[model samples]
Target chain A: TNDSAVLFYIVASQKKLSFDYTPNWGRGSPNSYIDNLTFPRVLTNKPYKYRVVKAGQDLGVRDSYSVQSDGSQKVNFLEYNAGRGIADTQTIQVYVVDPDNGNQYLVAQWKL
Target chain B: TNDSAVLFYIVASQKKLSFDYTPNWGRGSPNSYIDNLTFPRVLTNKPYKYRVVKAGQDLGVRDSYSVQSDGSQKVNFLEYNAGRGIADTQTIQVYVVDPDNGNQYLVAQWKL
Candidate 1:
């Protein structure tokens, strides 16, 4: 069985963050498929947070925000140096946090 | 503001269903980013259902299943004729249904 689900990510070192998707099962513009990739508002509204960790040590916490709309959101990384200040051995983990409960769900992680 | 989120889909006509993703925000192999694109198990277990609709009438209901693991799932479109029996004017809408609440969330829609 094949799955149509895909996960795409961008590194902080990239000047502009975006996702490139190729539809393996449909016909028409790629934008059409991208337009349909949307999740519920509740899930999108959850705050995206991240922290830099190295050798199991937490550097600090940072807040990232995204605006939810049309099944997608705009990610704006705040107070982060876009990987310029990150060490090559550090790991960055992004999480979707529940504002009400403070429960954090790990979303994507990158080893820089 | 830019978003690292993307949506990808496949049509029934495709013999083998799969998704093609390009990371617009990361460094290294694309597989690494795909590996991290996983949702919580609770959300993945929801049933994915679909139907062919034409002029406001649904042709029939079909059940599709996906095996969840490591944040990704394998989608198997069952009882579907691979679009061979479908008319070009018809539309297909895929939904993720909550078994407990009978809530159907529209995941994607295709107009064939």
Candidate 2:
């Protein structure tokens, strides 16, 4: 249920959270945050688990298709890079509300 | 730290505090949200962290590139996929911000 111009928000407790997002119209800009979000719109029609790593970061994740869990879906995201620099000893969970598109969106929490 | 042709701001009991997201755009009625955005502005280098999971959710993340912390350079977007259905549960992270002309751009976050 996703598409081009994928909109996203950032939440933080220390500073004011920003729901503000702008995309550059021309490729020569203040690029729009979600100017060109493209894809099969769907990565896998089937359920899929994933992981990512690069530079000095390592992340592990797991998510299930929309089912009926607490009436919500389940998803986990973790990042272990750049925290301790030479060493990584920090991890925190974030809960951001996603606008579901039926196409694809977010669900769940791992409280910080 | 980002840009676009469109700009909007709102605050509630706290705005951007949760509940500023007000639409499911572009449908023709396909009415997708903001139809276009593009850029390569320096993509300003910063540190931003975030998470999301749907149906119901949360994600854990950290950024170390910001002298200011995960303020923006690093971002995380997590989504819980549709259950048993053909959908996806995902967590996205954009940690690197890039700028080409002078505007802002994205860097990298989790796995998209």
Candidate DockQ scores, in order: 0.05, 0.02
> Per-residue CA lDDT of candidate 2, range A4-33, in tens?
222332222123432212211112123311
Q: How well is candidate 2 docked (DockQ)?
A: 0.02
**Maximum-TM-score candidate:** 1
The deviation in Å at residue B50 for candidate 2 is 15
Clashing pairs in 1: A10-B25, A10-B26, A11-B25, A25-B10, A25-B11, B38-B71, B88-B112
- Rate residue B107 of model 1 by lDDT: 42
**Candidate 1 lDDT, B1-112, residue by residue in tens:** 3332322323432435444222122112432221111123323334544333334443444554454564443322223434323333445443444443323444444443
Docking class of 1: incorrect
Instruction: Tell me the spans in candidate 2 whose CA falls farther than 4 Å from its real position.
Output: A1-57, A75-90, A94-112, B1-40, B43-112
For model 2, how does the per-residue alpha-carbon lDDT over B26-109 read when each residue is reduced to its tens digit? Answer: 111123212211112222332323232222332233332332232222111211122121112233322221111111112222
lDDT digits (tens) for residues A1-112 of candidate 1: 3342322223433445444222122112332221111122323333544433333443444554454454343222223434433333445443444444333344444344
